[PDB]
Amino acid sequence: QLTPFLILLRKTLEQLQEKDTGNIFSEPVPLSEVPDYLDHIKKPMDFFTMKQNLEAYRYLNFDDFEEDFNLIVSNCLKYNAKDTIFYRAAVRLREQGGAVLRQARRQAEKM
């Protein structure tokens, strides 16, 4: 059932965004500040874009939702040098997001 699944994904997305304590992943990487970003990153992702995708019915199973969270992280590791707060924040986001995604998947796989 689409409606309760979307409610679950909204809740899960809020839980993931609460882990972004640096407010680093909440909106697209701004090309005005990072002009070469697209030379390197084929599919940019961020929590605002995930919210738009959610309401546009782009996530119809948990896997596709989790895939895009994982892209937030992997894009950041790929673009930024290891010594940067951006890279380190992405490592932390992955670590903190794990439990959120694990629990939410079980709730989805009860439906």
Binding site: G22, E33, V34, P35, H40, A81
Partner: peptide, 8 residues
């Protein structure tokens, strides 16, 4: 490997 972002 990239331009980088400005230090936060």
């Amino acid at each position: 490997s990239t331009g980088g972002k400005a230090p936060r």
